[PDB]
Amino acid sequence: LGYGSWEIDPKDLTFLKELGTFGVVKYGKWRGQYDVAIKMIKEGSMSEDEFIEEAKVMMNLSHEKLVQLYGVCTKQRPIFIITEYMANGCLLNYLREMRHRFQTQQLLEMCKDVCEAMEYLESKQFLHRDLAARNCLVNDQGVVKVSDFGLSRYVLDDEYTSSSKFPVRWSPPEVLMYSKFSSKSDIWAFGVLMWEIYSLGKMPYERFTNSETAEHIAQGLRLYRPHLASEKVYTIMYSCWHEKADERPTFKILLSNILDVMDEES
Numbered sequence: 001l002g003y004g005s006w007e008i009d010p011k012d013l014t015f016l017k018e019l020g021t022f023g024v025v026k027y028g029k030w031r032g033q034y035d036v037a038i039k040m041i042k043e044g045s046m047s048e049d050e051f052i053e054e055a056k057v058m059m060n061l062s063h064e065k066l067v068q069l070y071g072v073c074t075k076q077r078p079i080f081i082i083t084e085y086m087a088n089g090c091l092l093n094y095l096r097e098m099r100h101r102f103q104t105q106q107l108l109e110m111c112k113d114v115c116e117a118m119e120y121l122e123s124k125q126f127l128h129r130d131l132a133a134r135n136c137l138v139n140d141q142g143v144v145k146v147s148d149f150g151l152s153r154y155v156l157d158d159e160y161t162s163s164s165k166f167p168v169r170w171s172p173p174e175v176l177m178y179s180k181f182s183s184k185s186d187i188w189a190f191g192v193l194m195w196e197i198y199s200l201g202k203m204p205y206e207r208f209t210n211s212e213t214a215e216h217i218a219q220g221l222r223l224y225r226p227h228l229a230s231e232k233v234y235t236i237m238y239s240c241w242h243e244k245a246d247e248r249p250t251f252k253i254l255l256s257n258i259l260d261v262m263d264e265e266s
């Protein structure tokens, strides 16, 4: 009583460990048994009513490679967003841990995991809008999942919203010049993410400012081949960066290309 299907009763949460500091993220349990992460939204950081309405839509998105939304806690402030627990944290930090000594087949599987999530979203006409390694999460089996999908829409802090904390390094020319978002801006960002994976978490355009990156990209220049990427892998990531948005592949085509490489570099 008093809760929609999208609504979690905060009294059903057991908090166990802070994971990091939108605000704080904690690890805990739901109804004693189910591991969860609980993102606590800072007062004033988000358009909450719009987010709540979107959450209803988001609860119906379901795919193995998309972090599963369990629901939202709306009746008090700060509001909470509750997901499955991803024990190995952010993809970006995971990549940067040199101890893993990743084989390129593992890096390719990470790309494939994300590509599968993104093909699903594309099939639902849902844009991510801020695809990057910092946003992807890794579970205890090393499976990568897409997280924070669409979330940028409800952030109120203007520095994130338009072209000084905007994702310049993951944005195609039409976004940086004209604010033209589309499926093909997610495709661009995916290619940059493949670059992040194959670079073991280097910052894209690591010696440039955002300002310089925007100018580089606008002039037609691109990220170059990470040393761990084969010529075929680099071909895939590069195809995501065509100057013409409609010459960029779809996520279905990218998935087929990644599967082909996996098979050939098996």
Ligand SMILES: *C(=N)N1CCC[C@@H](c2cnc(Oc3ccc(Oc4ccccc4)cc3)c(C(N)=O)c2)C1
Pocket: 019, 020, 021, 025, 036, 037, 038, 039, 058, 067, 069, 081, 082, 083, 084, 085, 086, 087, 089, 090, 093, 137, 147, 148, 149, 150, 151
């Ligand atoms: C990366 N270095 N970090 C710090 C360590 C904790 C990491 C983290 C952050 N969030 C979650 O869970 C999560 C993610 C996204 C949420 O909101 C959301 C989800 C889907 C669409 C829109 C918005 C809510 C919670 C985890 C986790 N799941 O373990 C870990 C981040």
